[PDB]
Design a protein around this nucleic acid. Structure first.
Ligand SMILES: Nc1ncnc2c1ncn2[C@@H]1O[C@H](COP(=O)(O)OP(=O)(O)OP(O)(O)=S)[C@@H](O)[C@H]1O
Ligand SMILES: Nc1ncnc2c1ncn2[C@@H]1O[C@H](COP(=O)(O)OP(=O)(O)OP(O)(O)=S)[C@@H](O)[C@H]1O
Ligand SMILES: Nc1ncnc2c1ncn2[C@@H]1O[C@H](COP(=O)(O)OP(=O)(O)OP(O)(O)=S)[C@@H](O)[C@H]1O
Ligand SMILES: [Mg+2]
Ligand SMILES: [Mg+2]
Ligand SMILES: [Mg+2]
Lengths: 438, 425, 494, 118
DNA sequence: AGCAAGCATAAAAGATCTAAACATAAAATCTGTA
DNA sequence: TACAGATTTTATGTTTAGATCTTTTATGCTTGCTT
């Protein structure tokens, strides 16, 4: 029936938040800070007053969500009274941000009604001339994500110029800077600190379980009569959320303890409602929440335990022998020779205590060693996994590491899973369980 | 749903999640979706099957392993997006934007915006999926590129009729866990079991093995007559099962290694088939045991001079034996890295161990052989780009394993084992 | 064509000439009277800046409400006299006036901390000089303002200045040679005095320090009528960059701008609110519009004690003149928010700015959110930091290996398993509350909370491939975390 | 490293193709992918590793694995020639078993020496 | 003669950086000569 | 005599060769000791 399809589509677009801004849902626990975001913007686009605000909060804390909902809300009634320039610290550079600002200014000014032509000096001079100078002024709203990446310790000229525009310009400018650092103020240089208004909004956090319960109720309640199942779906959801013993409340509580983030819960729930074929299956899936358990089990299927549970007999024996030789070593390091010596000692002892376990040779254990290294059960003795920057990665690529020079047999490794962890994971019925206790 | 789920053999949850996330409606599909798993876990296979079952989903397949650094990745994205958009809508008049002009992530954003703003003539919003097969496989990879690719979708226009949805199939979980706070929807691909690997191998290789030319010639050469459709399929399935149950410990749950082993050992297995043993698999296995006893995955170690061989012997003895030569000799500790020494000690040990003529002095030839040995990387130093062999601070070390030096010593009839047997055998 | 090893498809180059000014004329005696030529000293460009003025104007606007606190908020702006800078404005003006009247060259180096009124008083000095010259008391001069932080490249100091004195667009090296010839060689009968303000001179001299030497040296030439007013944050920057000998040769006029005291800052704020403090307004009770002299006749007042405390706090902390104004503006904003919430005015007896508003404005800046942030963290993250603190107590070491935190978390869960909360949370921490999920080495959301703390700036983790040896250390004070996990009852009991 | 090996291989390939044929491309495997469209003729790249012993075997192995990705085009043939100064056992020890199995599909051994056989 | 424990310290491995060598390119400017 | 066409000037980009630095383990020296 098309009614259940419409209901499922509505539920999915409620979870994704792509429903019209006339009916977008704002969680109660974050209905307060939105007002602040609603105030500042409405004091800059309506009252034409400059503002400089920094939103501090963790990843997926509804900074961009609230900042875009407010812009959409102001968009439908004050469309021609402001323009929006969006910058992202990850994909914009110090030189590149000037070009981004110029291009966005020209695009938005043509849209409402060049600056982007020339060298970087000319472009910056023109954007300074335009901004840092019946009828009113168009408000320039900077949505400036990852403000901490453009607040480095070597030079902060973009932030300096933007805050100087906020203070000493006749065109109203509103600058919202989203960041996750709790000490963003100390990142700015003292001139930029003085130019900044010290208006930091710390995004709200979930401090109660009732906050997440109400957020889930808002997410999964269809408030528009579009399907015959809407009333029954609301009844089922309310009766599954009212009782604290239900499976949905249990999973909400577990998310509250472990993750405490609505995006994780909605990621768990989206396939729950997309997988169901008819309304009865959806009701049973929301009453039992079996797919939540399946999703959680799948998410934990490539970590150390999941990878360890997918090893053959030879690979497991080599891993246990390497763990033993790393436990014996004072530095926790080893190599192929020591690990193979311990492995062959273990195999000889097992065969002597006796239908006999085959002892593979060095050429037949090199592949197992490489496979275990690929799964990152072993790493180099002193290895940096991935460099933070592109320049650091380039420098590392240029350098020729001593580890690759030495032969494969003598390369010094170091494990990620210790022998006690192997003892805990490995079942007591294994052949090598007696060999996981050194 | 209007999305059809393909029947993948051992990926039912993964296919269900793919159908749940990847949909033709831009409103109910995530901006970023991640497929995680290791080699041979059937992630590209599952995604290809899913996209083939749904011809109404626009996909732009990309292979970051060919695009070593980030600039080729951005340029290839810019080229392929516009090429695909032109392919789907050849009636839309468009201007060509050179992909080589994309040299920054913002330049990619601007080029994508310029490409998408000329497709506003479409009636309904569409989404094309940029599948990046192996974003973890970039050779020049850092921890900041994925941060750029996550937020790339924010700066592009929200109301455009062409939406870009990224799909990443990464390899390592250590890389994925760096971005665990981004809350990107992820589909995990656990490694297959031995039964799953065996079933995949038979269903993927039995048809090709049963039609192989070698079997075609063997059946007519042995003058055999049987059911072509079924008996040969059973023979190939039994061969694959024998290969799996013989080399699972060596290879693990790795499909590619077992495929290579099957390719290597099928001609030898079929060369042992005859009239009597084809009907009874036990006899055929007993007639070809040597195939399944050794992996055979390998495709006088050096032609060095006697001076070079004795130089290597002296270097190994000097490096792996403590400077206690003064007491008795010259008138395992080999499991660890070789130690360091000086040139004079190496020359003294070389003179001590060199056979008499009455002693061998250090000619030009000895030093030339030593420098050649360093050139062939058999002996190394504490070199760092610039190297000066004549500096007193330069110390030498050995780069041969015990087997190579043992073979060299036995070549010149030298008993290095007797020298090294004092500490341990 | 030739195959290119690499390509530069986005190269953007400006239309700037290369030949300096010294090669434009046949000889020094052939240089005309540059003062009367229509392109050098601003006689050509007058409306170039006005070209972009019309791009940011719109013809639509509703009757916006002007709250009684809106006047106070708008008046306490950086732009918006000169109470305290009267013994220093006087020095700058005296030096510049003496240099201008005698067609001489000089250098004024004014240095101080941010927000203390350097650029403002320099601009006021220049405005007074312009007013004096407009009365023909002193020779006319051209005012050029150069800001070191408003330029992409530090060598754009020349490109600007020459363009501001010749109308030509040259490269930076050609501009430098042109300026050298113009200042050293051109006779004083064919020149106008130039007053250059080198705002944020710190940014100009950071790599090659030649901007400082070039700009200070040009004030030593007899023919040059240049007057350089240098602004920097450090009082001894020329003595370091140039050296003692060069700086002694130049002969600066050095002025230091000390931070404002509480009394001077209070006087600044009072002068900023001279006509608005203790004033009267007509307020439309229906819409909220306030007009300065169903209407209501009200009185706007800002308590003097609020200004006292704001000025004293800002003077004690920083001494900024911007910080006190921003504190007062934020207090006015808080009062306006409360007023609008009480009356529901929205957008489109007497009112006062109380001491509590200024206290809130100060507490917003002073307080730190780390303790509040951890108080509301998830139990897994709090357990992580608790194990980190326990390892710090045991080892007395700032950096703890991640394996130590893992083992300590496991030991903490095992030892006090008789606790009801631990007994009921162990399954959800190790098996995700499911019987089909095997016991996990790392607790649920281990990577999530670890990356949360790393992103928040609470932890610093060294980059290494091995995840069991990476050392995580607190980036905050230990006492903050101690208080944060003392607040929680579960971690306090165990 | 791998990026420079790929860039120097693709630059040589493009230069040789343009010379034999008598716009601009990016120096990566997309050139190998689009060679049939650009020049209209199949591709027969022959790599010659001059001093395999001196070459870092990690980057050589990574480059071989990268070149393996070019096998999905029907218009390309890739041959490799390793100039070895020793026996191939050193290369076997210094290469991953996956690369060894990949090379074992087609390989020929040639004893190139001036003094070989006297 | 022969060697274990404690200490300081020269040193190996590598992060982080600079800069010369190698390379490309648009605007201005020199340079022929019809 | 103005011209196109060759050259220089200014401005970054790509890659290799060489440097200094921190960080951590090897190492000669010293002390105490028995053959
Ligand atoms: N424009 C949007 N409309 C609707 N939902 C959105 C929008 N942007 C983000 N979301 C969703 O909002 C949730 C979290 O909000 P976000 O704004 O993405 O997080 P965040 O505060 O931006 O964290 P950052 O920016 O990475 S530090 C996720 O489920 C997003 O999918
Ligand atoms: N469920 C399956 N059913 C049938 N064949 C499968 C299945 N999963 C994998 N295969 C086959 O096994 C091989 C796996 O190939 P891929 O799916 O490309 O591996 P992968 O997961 O992409 O790993 P990488 O990182 O790409 S090497 C192919 O030859 C597939 O045909
Ligand atoms: N004497 C004063 N009287 C009134 N207002 C003042 C006074 N001094 C500073 N202000 C205000 O505070 C602001 C400080 O600006 P500046 O004078 O440029 O400070 P500053 O010395 O330039 O600090 P920098 O440029 O960051 S080193 C001015 O714009 C005024 O709004
Ligand atoms: Mg964001
Ligand atoms: Mg793949
Ligand atoms: Mg200033």
């Amino acid at each position: 029936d098309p009614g259940f399809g419409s209901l499922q589509r509505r539920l999915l677009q409620q979870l994704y938040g792509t429903l019209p801004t006339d009916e977008k849902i704002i969680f109660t626990y974050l209905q307060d800070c939105q007002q602040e975001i609603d105030r500042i913007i409405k004091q800059s686009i309506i009252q034409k007053e400059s503002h400089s605000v920094i939103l501090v909060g963790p990843r997926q804390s509804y900074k961009t969500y609230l900042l875009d909902y407010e812009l959409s809300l102001l968009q439908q009634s004050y469309k021609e009274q402001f323009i929006t320039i969006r910058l992202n610290g990850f994909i914009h550079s110090e030189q590149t941000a000037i070009n981004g600002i110029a291009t966005q200014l020209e695009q938005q000014l043509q849209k409402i009604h060049t600056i982007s032509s020339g060298s970087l000096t000319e472009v910056f001079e023109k954007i300074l001339l335009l901004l840092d100078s019946s009828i009113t002024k168009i408000t320039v709203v900077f949505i400036f994500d990852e403000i901490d990446t453009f607040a480095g310790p070597v030079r902060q000229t973009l932030l300096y110029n933007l805050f100087d525009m906020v203070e000493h310009s006749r065109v109203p400018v509103c600058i919202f800077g989203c960041t996750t650092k709790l000490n963003i103020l100390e990142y700015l240089e003292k001139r930029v600190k003085s130019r900044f208004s010290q208006r930091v909004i710390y995004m709200p956090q979930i401090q109660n379980l009732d906050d997440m319960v109400d957020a889930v109720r808002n997410l999964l309640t269809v408030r528009s009569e579009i399907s015959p199942w809407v009333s029954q779906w609301n009844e089922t959801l309310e009766k599954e959320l009212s009782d604290p013993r239900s499976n949905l409340n249990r999973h909400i509580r577990m998310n509250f303890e472990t993750f405490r983030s609505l995006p994780t819960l909605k990621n768990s729930i989206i396939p729950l409602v997309a997988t169901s074929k008819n309304f009865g299956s959806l009701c049973t899936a929301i009453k039992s929440c079996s797919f939540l358990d399946i999703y959680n089990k799948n998410q934990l299927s490539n970590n150390l335990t999941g990878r360890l549970q997918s090893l053959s007999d030879l690979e497991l024996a080599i891993l246990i022998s390497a763990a033993r030789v790393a436990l014996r070593a004072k530095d926790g390091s080893f190599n192929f020779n020591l690990a193979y010596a311990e492995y062959e000692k273990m195999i000889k002892a097992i065969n002597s205590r006796i239908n006999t376990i085959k002892l593979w040779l060095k050429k037949d254990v090199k592949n197992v060693w490489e496979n275990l290294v690929q799964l990152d059960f072993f790493t180099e003795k002193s290895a940096v996994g991935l460099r933070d920057n592109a320049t650091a990665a380039f420098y590392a690529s240029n350098y020729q590491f001593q580890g690759t020079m030495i032969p494969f047999d003598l390369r010094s490794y170091q494990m990620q899973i210790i022998l006690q962890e192997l003892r805990r994971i490995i079942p007591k019925s294994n052949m090598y369980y007696s060999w996981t206790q050194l | 749903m209007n999305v059809t789920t393909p029947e993948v053999a051992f990926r039912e949850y993964q296919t269900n999640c793919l159908a749940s996330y990847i949909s033709a409606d831009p409103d109910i599909t995530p901006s970023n979706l991640i497929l995680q798993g290791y080699s041979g876990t059937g992630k590209t296979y599952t995604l290809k099957k899913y996209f083939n079952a749904n011809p109404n989903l626009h996909a732009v397949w990309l292979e970051p392993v060919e695009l070593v650094s980030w600039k080729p990745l951005l340029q290839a994205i810019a080229r392929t997006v516009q090429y695909k958009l032109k392919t789907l809508y050849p009636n839309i008049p468009t201007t060509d934007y050179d992909p080589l002009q994309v040299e920054e992530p913002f330049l990619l954003v601007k080029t994508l915006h310029n490409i998408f703003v000329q497709y506003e003539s479409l009636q309904e919003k569409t989404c094309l999926f940029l599948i990046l097969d192996g974003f973890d496989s970039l050779q020049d990879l850092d921890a900041a590129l994925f941060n750029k690719y996550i937020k790339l979708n924010e700066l592009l226009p929200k109301d455009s009729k062409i939406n870009i949805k990224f799909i990443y199939t990464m390899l390592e979980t250590s890389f994925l866990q760096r971005y665990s706070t981004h809350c990107i929807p992820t589909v995990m691909f656990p490694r297959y079991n031995v039964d799953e690997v065996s079933t995949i191998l038979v269903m993927s290789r039995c048809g090709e093995l049963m039609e192989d030319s070698c079997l075609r010639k063997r059946i007519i050469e042995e003058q055999i007559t049987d059911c072509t459709d079924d008996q040969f399929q059973n023979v190939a399935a039994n061969f694959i099962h024998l290969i799996v149950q013989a080399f699972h410990s060596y290879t693990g749950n790795d499909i590619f290694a077992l495929n290579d082993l099957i390719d290597f050992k099928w001609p030898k297995y079929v060369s042992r088939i005859t009239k009597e043993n084809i009907f009874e698999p036990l006899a055929l296995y007993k007639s070809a045991i040597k195939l399944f006893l050794s992996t055979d995955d390998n495709l006088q170690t050096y032609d060095l001079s006697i001076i070079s061989k004795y130089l290597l012997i002296a270097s190994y003895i000097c490096s792996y034996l403590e400077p206690r030569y003064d007491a008795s000799i010259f008138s395992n500790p080999r499991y660890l890295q070789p130690s360091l020494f000086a040139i004079e000690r190496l020359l003294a040990i070389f003179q001590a161990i060199f056979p008499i003529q009455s002693l061998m002095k250090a000619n030009i030839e000895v030093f030339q052989n030593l420098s050649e040995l360093h050139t062939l990387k058999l002996i190394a130093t504490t070199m760092n780009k610039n190297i000066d062999y004549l500096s007193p601070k330069v110390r030498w070390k050995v780069n041969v394993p015990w087997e190579i030096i043992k073979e060299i010593s036995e070549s010149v009839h030298f008993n290095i084992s007797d020298y090294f047997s004092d500490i341990h055998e | 064509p030739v195959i290119r090893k690499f390509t530069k498809k986005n190269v953007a180059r400006a239309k700037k000439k290369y030949t300096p000014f010294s090669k434009r004329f046949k000889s020094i005696a052939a240089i005309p009277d540059l003062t009367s030529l229509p392109e050098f000293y601003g006689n050509s460009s007058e409306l170039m800046a006005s070209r972009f003025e019309n791009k940011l104007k719109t013809t639509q606007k509703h009757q916006i409400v002007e709250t009684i606190f809106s006047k106070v908020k708008k008046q306490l702006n950086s732009s918006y006299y000169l109470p305290a800078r009267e013994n220093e404005f006087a020095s700058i003006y005296l030096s510049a006036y003496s240099a201008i009247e005698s067609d001489s060259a000089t250098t004024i180096y004014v240095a101080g901390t941010p927000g203390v009124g350097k650029t403002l008083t320099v601009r006021e000095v220049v405005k007074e000089l312009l007013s004096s010259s407009a009365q023909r008391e002193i020779p006319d001069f051209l005012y050029v303002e150069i800001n070191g932080l408003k330029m992409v490249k530090p060598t754009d100091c020349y490109e600007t200045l020459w363009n501001k004195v010749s109308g030509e667009r040259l490269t930076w090296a050609a501009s430098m040679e042109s300026l050298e010839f113009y200042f050293k060689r051109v006779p004083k009968n064919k020149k106008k005095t130039i007053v250059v303000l080198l705002d944020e001179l710190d940014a100009m001299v950071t790599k090659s320090q030649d901007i400082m030497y070039n700009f200070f040296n040009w004030t030593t030439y007899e023919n040059a009528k240049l007057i350089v007013i240098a602004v920097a944050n450090t009082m001894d920057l020329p003595e370091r960059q140039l050296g003692n000998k060069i700086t002694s040769r130049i002969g600066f006029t050095r002025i230091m701008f000390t931070g404002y005291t509480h009394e001077e800052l209070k006087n600044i704020i009072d002068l900023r609110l001279k006509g608005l403090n203790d004033s009267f307004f007509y307020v439309d009770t229906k819409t909220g519009n306030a007009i300065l002299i169903d209407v209501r006749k009200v009185r706007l007042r800002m308590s003097a004690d609020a200004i006292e405390i704001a000025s004293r706090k800002v003077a004690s902390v920083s001494g900024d003149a911007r910080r006190a104004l921003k504190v007062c503006k934020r207090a006015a904003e808080i009062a306006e928010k409360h007023y609008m919430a009480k009356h529901g005015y929205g957008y489109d007896g007497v009112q006062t700015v109380h001491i509590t508003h200024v206290m809130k404005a100060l507490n917003e800046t002073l307080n730190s959110h780390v303790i509040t942030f951890m108080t509301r963290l998830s139990f897994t993250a709090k357990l992580f930091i608790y194990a980190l603190l326990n390892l710090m107590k045991k080892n007395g070491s700032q950096e703890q290996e991640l394996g130590d935190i893992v083992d300590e978390i496991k030991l903490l869960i095992e030892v006090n398993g008789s606790n009801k909360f631990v007994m009921e949370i162990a399954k959800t921490l190790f098996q995700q509350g499911s019987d089909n999920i095997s016991e996990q080495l790392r607790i649920i959301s281990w990577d999530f909370v670890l990356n949360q703390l790393l992103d928040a700036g609470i932890l610093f983790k060294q980059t290494m491939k091995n995840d069991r040896i990476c050392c995580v250390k607190l980036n905050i004070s230990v006492e903050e975390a101690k208080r944060a996990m003392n607040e929680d009852e579960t971690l306090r009991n165990l | 490293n791998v990026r420079m090996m790929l860039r120097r291989s693709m630059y040589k390939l493009y230069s040789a193709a343009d010379a034999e044929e008598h716009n601009d491309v990016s120096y990566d495997l997309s050139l190998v992918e689009n060679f049939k469209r650009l020049f209209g003729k199949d591709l027969a790249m022959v790599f010659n590793f001059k001093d395999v012993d001196s070459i870092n075997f990690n980057t050589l192995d990574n480059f071989i694995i990268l070149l393996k990705s070019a096998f999905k085009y029907d218009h390309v043939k890739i041959s490799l020639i390793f100039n070895i100064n020793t026996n191939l056992s050193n290369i076997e020890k210094n290469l991953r078993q996956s690369t060894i199995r990949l090379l074992k599909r087609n390989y020929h051994k040639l004893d190139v020496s001036s003094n070989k056989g006297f």
